[PDB]
């Protein structure tokens, strides 16, 4: 049993290893030659994956019985190449093509599926533009197809490309982990407990599971996210991400790749998200129970502030090369796991 | 920071991994060519071990920080060598020397401390051998468990945890059973980690050790004591916020431990087809770790021991 991992950056690593625990063989493809997965791979790869012919040629001639694609930078026709029985795609090339086009996936998520997302336009002229402006009102996002906020410059209530947003005020960002395997009975869908996560002060990030909501906007997220998931098929690990302001909830994206916020599972759940997406790949069962309440804060180590971080309560750490690591702490309450991992990540940064 | 693995078996690559998690390259070291820590170590090194002139070589060029016994057949003259001369020992020399002198062990537990075992007698019952052979008087005994001891540095100093009562056994198939929490009386736990604790502390040094009992009720006896992650260790994968591996990865490198318990669990070590793997992973809460040349582990938690072993006993029954 060999699978194939397209991308070698620090998750890579991780679902390299789970990989490797469930008894496979693992090829580590990427571009440059020390990357992360490539030191505990069993095969390392360089090739330029952006590159149809050059890709196209390693996968024929390595022959992997699973290919799975964890960066973005990848050639989505070479992968259509191999899936035109002999390796399974995991995700498929669907999945990967369809959520690398931003304006396809929004244009799949609002108007083929009803799902709701915030208000928003493609533009490609100025005025184009100008009536967006008259007719939404203020504030806007404009954004190239950096993104900078349109807050300023209708007289009767009846009335290459730039995305234009409706600013809708937010409470939670929330990420859905959606797990599509099977299990000994056939297919399995599951979700994780909703992960909340934010911005923190010295530009890292921070998570932390379970995310409460109420019964509706539960519903709806479980609703959402299920619904674009089967939309785009195939085994795998979605990251489908959400908006929530009380009862409403709003899709803004799906990852095929595990995602920063999904750091938090490696102590929150009895399987992390990589031994998940190790089992999707492989097509073996999974459950999605908790542990305990956890948070994460992904940095982007000196002897003596290891030391420190560890000296926090129900702490661990991952290190990983220059300025990557993460701090995790758990606890039985959400509130102090943040406080926990915000003490871990200060005592190391 | 830089630790070096003599041995390079299967619980030497979790190790290993636990160690690169929290930021160290690790050395791995064996005798044969395809050790199972050399495939994810940063530098692997082949080298007979037992032989004091080519261990010590291999030691004096590389210079680790952290100097790791994971393997029994080790030269233990090369290694008080380097106590003697840059490099820190986890475990310590004198616990390596002490724990393979099967004879001085059980005279240090039962002499110099005071430590309760079976009667034994060494002439030149149980008649093993050891020249020597070593007599032992039959004890009637409910549960074999091992205690895991942790030796470690807090951000305040020293350390000094318990695990939980891990309780294991022979079980059918040949596989060695294992599951955490064993319960124990009040008398029987104070006794267990009496002995536990005078063991290790006279060993000393940082380190992870496993103290094997014998209990019937009330009475607790002295086994042995191992400074390597014993099989029925593996429960741990599972069963504990940080496991066995983790737990030794942070004791080497003087980091802070607890030994907080996920839930209860099971696990047998068997001594993998795609169908054996599905159809084993369909138990609930259940888990597996495939190695080697047929080396598996089967683990199940559960709310109770006792779930936890019939799911195990099953994920193993599924993959056998």
């Known amino acids: 049993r ?11 690593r991780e679902l390299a290893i789970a990989l490797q625990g469930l008894g496979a063989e693992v090829i580590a ?9 490539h030191r505990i791979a069993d095969q390392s790869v360089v090739v330029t994956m952006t590159d149809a012919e050059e890709l196209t040629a390693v996968i024929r001639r390595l022959q992997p019985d699973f290919l799975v694609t964890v960066t973005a930078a990848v050639s989505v026709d070479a992968l259509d190449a191999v899936e035109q029985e002999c390796t399974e795609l995991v995700p498929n090339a669907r999945a990967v093509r369809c959520t690398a086009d931003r304006e396809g996936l929004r244009r799949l998520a609002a108007d083929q599926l009803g799902l709701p997302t915030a208000p928003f336009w493609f533009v490609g002229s100025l005025g184009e533009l100008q009536a967006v402006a ?17 807050a300023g410059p209708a007289g009767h209530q009846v009335q290459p490309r730039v995305c234009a947003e409706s ?4 409470e939670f960002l929330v990420t859905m982990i959606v797990v599509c395997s099977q299990g000994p009975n056939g297919p399995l869908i599951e979700f994780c407990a909703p992960i909340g996560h934010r911005d923190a002060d010295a530009g890292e990030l921070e998570s932390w599971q379970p995310q409460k909501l109420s019964t509706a ?5 479980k609703s959402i996210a299920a619904r674009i998931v089967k939309a785009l098929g195939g085994r795998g690990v979605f990251g489908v991400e959400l908006m929530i302001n009380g009862d409403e909830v709003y899709f803004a994206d799906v990852t095929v790749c595990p995602a920063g916020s999904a750091w938090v599972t490696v102590r929150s759940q009895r399987l992390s998200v990589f031994e998940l997406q190790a089992r999707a790949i492989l097509g073996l069962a999974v459950d999605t129970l908790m542990i305990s309440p956890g948070a994460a804060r992904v940095i982007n180590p000196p002897a003596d502030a290891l030391t420190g971080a560890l000296g926090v309560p129900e702490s661990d750490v991952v290190i990983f090369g220059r300025g990557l690591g993460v701090a995790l702490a758990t606890a039985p309450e959400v509130a102090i796991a943040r406080e926990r991992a915000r003490e871990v990540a200060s005592r190391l940064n």
Do not use: N
Request: proline fraction near 9%; avoid cysteine.
């Open 2 to 12: 060999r699978v194939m991992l397209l991308g070698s950056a620090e998750p890579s």
């Open 167 to 170: 600013v809708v005020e937010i």
């Open 29 to 37: 493809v990427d571009g440059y030659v020390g990357a992360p997965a």
């Open 134 to 150: 008259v007719h939404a009102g203020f504030p806007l996002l404009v954004s190239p197809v950096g993104s900078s906020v349109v």
């Open 217 to 221: 906007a539960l519903d709806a997220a």
